[PDB]
Design a protein around this ligand. Structure first.
Ligand code: MG
Ligand code: MG
Ligand code: MG
Ligand code: NA
Length: 303
């Protein structure tokens, strides 16, 4: 509206993904860029050198700007700040060559910036902040404990991967950006609705980050459904990617069904109507951002 512009998703090559999802780009995207800069500067200040890109993407839109385009402008910078730290902390958790000395050495710095993000969120919106802290902690713990599990189906993998990829974490941030809280009743019913959305987000990331994650497998755990399909079905990269592409399309359709099924079995409030809409923008934003984000695409990298 006055906070985001509608963007024609057909102007992008999405490999058949994102059909019937609308795409929006936050008008205050510079605040997301500012949040990511400050987070990266604090990382070098308290942790160590930067070794990768996070949410930044000036071509197709900052991660926060397209994934969360309904965010209130006064909350976009902090959300992007949090996500940028999460982007960088994510690769630390996946690392397999980190010495016990460096892990001890970086523990206090990681703690400081984590506590800095939680404190700022609590000071702005306490109810929303508590959900962010809960999901953030659950994602880190789940990743730490379960990242080495050998899954033998995409279904089993996704129960872990939806948490590892940060889908509830990002949902909690999106609610904070809306200044929105759900009742425990609404929490219960909407959990079933957004499960295929979480899976679409997780598998879409696998699709577009597989090349980069294969490049890092010498030093990082490979958590990717493309690899799983390759092993269990004895397929090469593009054939496995096609199967994941098809699986993404299935989850995308299932999400649209559950949104409309919710609307049928339950006159919804305009709050829940906004919630449903905001969730669909995660799908289109995550998809378009992953197309040429420097994080996964080296010929878009700089500096
Ligand atoms: Mg990860
Ligand atoms: Mg990762
Ligand atoms: Mg990935
Ligand atoms: Na990895």
């Amino acid at each position: 509206s006055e906070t985001s512009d509608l963007v024609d998703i057909s102007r992008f090559d999405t490999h058949g993904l994102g059909a019937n999802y609308k795409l929006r780009r936050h008008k205050f995207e510079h605040l997301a860029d500012t949040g990511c800069h400050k987070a990266r500067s604090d990382w070098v200040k308290y942790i160590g050198p930067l070794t990768e890109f996070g949410g930044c993407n000036h071509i197709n839109g900052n991660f926060s700007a397209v994934v969360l385009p309904l965010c209130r402008p006064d909350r976009l910078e902090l959300i992007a700040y949090v996500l940028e730290f999460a982007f960088l902390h994510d690769s630390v958790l996946e690392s397999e060559n980190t010495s016990p000395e460096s892990e001890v050495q970086a523990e206090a710095g990681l703690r400081l910036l984590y506590e800095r993000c939680i404190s700022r969120l609590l000071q702005t919106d306490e109810v929303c902040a508590k959900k962010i802290a809960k999901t953030w902690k659950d994602a880190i713990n789940t990743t730490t404990k379960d990242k080495n599990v050998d899954f033998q189906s995409i279904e089993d993998y996704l129960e872990f991967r939806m948490i590892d990829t940060g889908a509830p974490f990002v949902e909690a941030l999106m609610l904070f950006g809306l200044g929105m809280s759900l009742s425990p009743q609404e929490d219960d019913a909407l959990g079933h609705v957004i499960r295929p959305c979480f899976a679409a987000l997780a598998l879409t990331n696998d699709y577009f980050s597989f090349d980069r994650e294969i490049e890092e497998v010498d030093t990082s755990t490979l958590i990717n459904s493309v690899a799983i399909v390759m092993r269990i079905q004895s397929l090469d990269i593009p054939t496995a990617k096609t199967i994941i592409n098809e699986t993404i399309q299935k989850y995308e359709r299932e999400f649209l069904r559950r949104i409309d099924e919710y609307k049928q079995h339950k006159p919804i409030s305009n709050k829940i109507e906004q919630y449903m809409e905001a969730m669909t923008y995660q799908i289109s934003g995550n998809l378009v951002w992953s197309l040429n984000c420097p994080r996964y695409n080296p010929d878009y990298r700089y500096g």
